[PDB]
Homo-oligomer: A and B are copies of this chain.
Amino acid sequence: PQITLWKRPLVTIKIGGQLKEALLDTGADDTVIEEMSLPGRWKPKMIGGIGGFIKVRQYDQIIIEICGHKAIGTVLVGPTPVNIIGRNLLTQIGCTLNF
């Protein structure tokens, strides 16, 4: 698909058997999801930007379905104000910026 930027680019995702709404964010290096359980090992990480930093749990090799496109990668879980699909997963679905 082609997504315009008149509004926030929010899409439905499937992660850990749950349907969630997430923002396609080219400015984010990593994917960050609101608090939820994920299987496997995790390690702590700090991520930051506008407003400062937050502590998150880093889970590796997590499958996410974004607009019917399957992608696998690291998913950070923590107190984010919005679910964010960052570059680590946008590349896997072949997402590009065009102008």
- A residues 1-37 with Cβ under 8 Å of B? 1-6, 8-9, 23-29, 32
Closest Cβ–Cβ distance, residue A55 to chain B (whole Å): 11
User: CA of A52 to CA of B86 in the docked complex: distance in angstroms?
Assistant: 19
What is the size category of the interface that chain A forms with chain B? 35 or more
**Interface mask (A68-99 → B, CB under 8 Å = 1, otherwise 0):** 01000000000011001001001101111111
| A39 in the interface (beta carbon within 8 A) | no
| A49 in the interface (beta carbon within 8 A) | yes
Given contact pairs A1-B98, A26-B97, a sample of 9 additional A-B residue pairs in the complex whose CB atoms are under 8 Å apart? A2-B96, A2-B98, A5-B26, A23-B26, A24-B97, A25-B25, A49-B52, A50-B50, A96-B98
| A40 in the interface (beta carbon within 8 A) | no
A99 and B91 in contact (CB under 8 A), knowing A25-B26, A51-B51?
no
| A44 in the interface (beta carbon within 8 A) | no
